[model samples]
Target chain A: EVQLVESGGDLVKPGGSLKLSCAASGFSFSSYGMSWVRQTPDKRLEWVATISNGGGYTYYPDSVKGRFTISRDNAKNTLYLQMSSLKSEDSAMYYCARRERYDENGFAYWGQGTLVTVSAAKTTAPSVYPLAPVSSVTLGCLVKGYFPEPVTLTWNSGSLSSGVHTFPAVLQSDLYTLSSSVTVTSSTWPSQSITCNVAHPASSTKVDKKIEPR
Target chain B: DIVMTQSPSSLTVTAGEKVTMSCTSSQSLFNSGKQKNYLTWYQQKPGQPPKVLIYWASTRESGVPDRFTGSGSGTDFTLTISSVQAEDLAVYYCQNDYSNPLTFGGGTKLELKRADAAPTVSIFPPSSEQLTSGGASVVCFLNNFYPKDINVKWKIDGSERQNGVLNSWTDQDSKDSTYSMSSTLTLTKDEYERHNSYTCEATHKTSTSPIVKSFNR
Candidate 1:
């Protein structure tokens, strides 16, 4: 009977790195080694590596480059795994496990997993643009690291009706990212407000920055 | 006890191809017994975690990979990759299921055989010392139960050490419905004393824990 306690959620961005921890209780930390495993948002699980209690020896599976490391702090009964080079595809849940002897099963015990999400940081600068006719100018949306799903460009304060929109794909670190673009031919482009709204699986949030023509 | 883990989550493979899986644990699962040593093995698939594969060092499960083999013992053990299949692309794990806080090896997910996909391997449940030097002989014995098969060998740095012979015997336990087994590894006193480790591993098909013993003298 082994109990494993894991850390809380983490929100990271592409190119960033993060470290998570799994703590053990109701067992002797020195008596056993600790292991880390990864499960993607879609629930696909992968093996990371293990850390020894004595000399801190680590063994990583060949499929994994040295992007991860496992270590233990015996005094706190905690095992840590650090993953680097974060990407949107790297978002997932991580778990810890313990070995059992009485049963023939391997890794019969496990800990609850932690969820990790990667998102772009919102831009804080305010937009400063002179009034211009909406029909003559194009609205621009800057999406840094995240790959946008369905983004729509529309004048929220004008008479232009909203409709489904699609954008061409661009490559970023081998991942396809998308941004919506549309030429505002209406007078609202300069005097009225416009927005590029993005939506995905569970929820959607919008970032509004007025468009300025050069 | 040892702890094992795997990476990359999922791998895709085709039928009749070869791929490698890795396993690891934390501490050395080797221990001392009456006359021989003991060890065990396990496997873990997707969704579900790990399951026992081979135990007592090298004895295979009722039906396992002719390509899947176990060698080395004590502080270090190695599971070799002979060949693999599409069904084998799932996660594979190993553990010493005999000791407490039982330990496992880091897992390796087999994937579709490609032009240059490297075979996978990993070692968990790490031990501080390697069985490098020494002429040491160890024997392990169990009472009140009998095992069908057992494997014994000398190991160095997680690999098999050749040039030695192993002998074993079995007896019935009249009191308990089960049987018992014993194994012996005999080497020169210098061999035993010169070698860093000598291990005797025994397994019981019906038993959860296989007994393992190592001597570093």
Candidate 2:
């Protein structure tokens, strides 16, 4: 049986480009045609492109016609799909398959899917809050409404650093929200003024919110 | 579905003479069920429906004549008859039941002492006038055989060439009713004008060896 191996997936921004790769083994590399198919996140299947076996005969669908190209290097037994001008709609799980008969629309072998994620980079300052706003009288810090997910949330001046707890980012929609809490063993809110400093890819200036006494 | 092929397109046998036919598969008919193949053999008479001769590759269904036996494993298989008889003059078929009776091989006819035609194979070289890209397509034409689905291939030196090869639809000839087909190996000027030998080869069921045609700069 033919074995078709694919390259790893990628995360790109709108208008960015990516190169998708597929490598083959266990069969004559150039004998059978190779095809690329992409299934969107919503489970819509798209026949992206195809290259004929033993010769480079390429066919592309209208949607991906101008922006996508399929190529191969028999030296490495690999096929490549170079995609340009990526859009959110371009996000998909891409697959490569070997065609036993180039004249037919079926495949003899398929590669493990490679996921391509295309998202726009939007910058929005975190909206900070007290998460029940919790602890031995615990204090809460919630940062919401952000893009590209990665961020920094740290307690003020390193005080009460030992008992601080941070939560994972909550992906509610296109934006994200995260929560963290600080505990005071004395069973009362700490006297020292505390702050939750936030840093994100979208934010030019660090955003911080003060912890208020409950 | 797995690809399949059978041998001895037609066999002539006299009563009391034992005969054996072969069925070869491109895939392993073996699976995880009781150490047997997912293969079945059937015998179809001239005017009636077919009967199950054997199953599980070697397992004869109940009431099957003891003279009819099936054996072999993996890609190679056989359906043997103890002796030829008047009742056995029919078409024998070997089928693959992988994922449920999908691919069936060509029937091996139990017939007369007749002859079949050998395939005609020829290779056509590329020319600049064929395409605008400075590259050209090399074509291999095959046809005029009683049996059409012959094995076709392309090569350089001795190793097989797989990439950039396209096969044409196998069509029946109008006058002779013989089978016909064409295969193309598309190449660029640098690729086509290479200083080496290229070959096109085909194997007809009538012959054990392949018919080869070669080309070079």
Candidate 3:
């Protein structure tokens, strides 16, 4: 039976480095390219790269153009993903797959996925910032030291869900710290208090970070 | 919609000749902001899956011979082989490394001739020229076929076998516009002596039927 066995899971800090491995068996390793695809906590599938067969060429998305590298060892029948700069947002389960005959985004085989958890150094509450203008008002919610991420950011208890942009948790001291922002019409500026509420599972308390005209 | 179009559909060339093929994309592959071209090239030979040769336009894959080169940008690209060996005579293709719904060009099949010809098939025991690795072998040979597309499978005791099967294909004599290839099945001493019969089924699209050859020890 064909098999792709990924290396065990690892827990790293924000500044550390990590290398994932997938050892292959039951086929000619050098005849096929191997791909690194990852699943984010939000069930989003992100393709990291595919080390081509025969030539060992590499193809990756712009998001990870230079943050890491993908390669393989034909002699040992193993594929690898080496990350030099680890960040909190890098927490995800990675999968190594045998590319379909030739080089495209097709995979005939995949491993059981190796999990990488980049834990935060500390936990902190969300901070709200009022950066707005004439046409529309934009509020920024900067949450530092957030762990077990995907913090629920509520605008006055779900008042303004549209025009909200939340970037995935990034690498930092925050428990997978993340940033979110929402844009509201100038008509509602300052007259109404808008709050960015965050639930803190670790603290068993929620912080209703609010913003209004001073 | 990223549509890929390949040029010259096919080519006829002699051994040791240089060859180049073009692949044009419907949209520019270059992402100016990222400074990257999301294109890749591959070569698919007979009886085996395709293999990547160059990726991101010009990065020759690891261990890929320097003779094979990929170049161009945006919506156009080229795959050039400084000199083509008989083994290098195969189908070429273009595929985007990072596009979806998975796009590929109509493959460019390199050939010894434009006309279709059925190859003659023959089989024999291992020869001194071949390394047996302390085992015996049954060899199947083909000659003078155009549009190099052929597949050979072996059977023993009426059952199909795939393990330890090896093949090599190349262009034939210079004056002749044809190709030659071989397939060998290695067997241990005990297996070779005990095997009463061996069969080779050679399949080529140009032929009306499969060329089946058999031998008994």
Candidate 4:
């Protein structure tokens, strides 16, 4: 038996791009192929693209010919669907299905559908806040209010030690928020300064916040 | 791409009654040189994935009962269930694997008729590619059987082997909900050269006797 899961944000701005991921389990991921299918509100099924497991082969429908990218990370047993230059018509429920064989058509199994909406919206920068460390050796940062869906956040410091954890992002209203924490020993706090960087590609803008240990 | 079509959108039969369905393709599925057809039949039950029942036209998958038979060539095909049973209700589809953009038939549904009839089983030899490998694996593909319960066992030189790995059985929900199952047995170069006889025995309720197929190294 095999199962597939599809996940991605539900909304994106027109002209902006979004990435959808499909994770497969319970089967030999490298031995089979997977494809992405989408159904619009009108209830028509459209073949988007396909990629063989372990990055073997790929195909795309004429409608999405050059704009849709299909790729896979063999190590994670995950398939990615990247849609760029989005339009309002791109809003649809996307699904992932297993191909009967690498060269054969028709799907034997399917994942639950994921909805993506493309609309016109404003781009917003994220607000960054440095939270007081709960432990003597810990430091944390919270980022919120980012728009156009996905945002990248990273923590950087010259004197910091190892142990970094980034939590999952949460959807708050129309924006997304995320938090990350890092470990820093008291001995290095005196000379260390950490910076949290949040980048929004849609707006081509980046915001950074620097903080020193009290 | 070859198009597949099934007839009698839906039908019903009583237990023990005979039933038949039709499948037609837009083009010939026969390969003259290979003497094989790319046509396949499948059964899909509600809430479950579809399963393969017959492939290459008339060949039954391992463990499929004798009651379920497939016949036809070129562009026309038929799947017959000798007797109808309570478990035979489902939708049947035909698929063509001869070319790209593979396609499936619209499907035919089978249900119990208000008052009618009755309803509806290999070791594949090791391929030439395995001849060079120090270790070789041969698969026993079982197709077209029923009840979803069966036992598969392997033996070497008349001695039962317990360590042989068996895969989960697959179903083809074909006419009468028949199924297909498969398992693979691996052998070392020494064993292959020893000329040991390998056998795959299947036990299922559909047969009064156990079914056995054998291969020799």
**Candidate closest to the true structure, highest TM-score:** 4
Worst ten-residue run, lDDT, model 4 chain A?
A157-166
DockQ-derived CAPRI band for the predicted complex in model 3? incorrect
lDDT of 4 by residue, B55-84 (tens): 778877656677889999999999999996
Question: Candidate 2 docking category?
Answer: incorrect
| Superior by lDDT: candidate 3 or candidate 4 | 3
RMSD of 1: 27.7
Model 1, A119-186: lDDT tens per residue? 57431221111121122444434332343322333444334443212233333443333333344555
Candidate 3's DockQ is 0.01
**Better-scoring candidate (TM-score), 2 or 4:** 4
Compared with the true structure, all predictions reach lDDT values of 0.48, 0.67, 0.68, 0.66
**Model 1 misplaced regions, further than 4 Å:** A41-43, A62-64, A99-106, A119-214, B1-217
> Residue B18 in candidate 3 has what lDDT?
81
TM-score of each: 0.32, 0.33, 0.34, 0.43
TM-score order, best first, reads 4, 3, 2, 1
Model 1 TM-score on a 0 to 1 scale: 0.32
Candidate 1 vs 4: which has more DockQ: 1
Candidate 4 local lDDT, A5-79, one digit each (tens): 889846777878889999899987778778887766443345577787668688875667677899988788998
> Candidate 4, which CAPRI tier?
incorrect
- How far residue A202's Cα lies from its native spot in candidate 4, in Å, is 27
Chain A TM-score by candidate, in order: 0.52, 0.58, 0.55, 0.54
Better of 2 and 3 by DockQ: 3
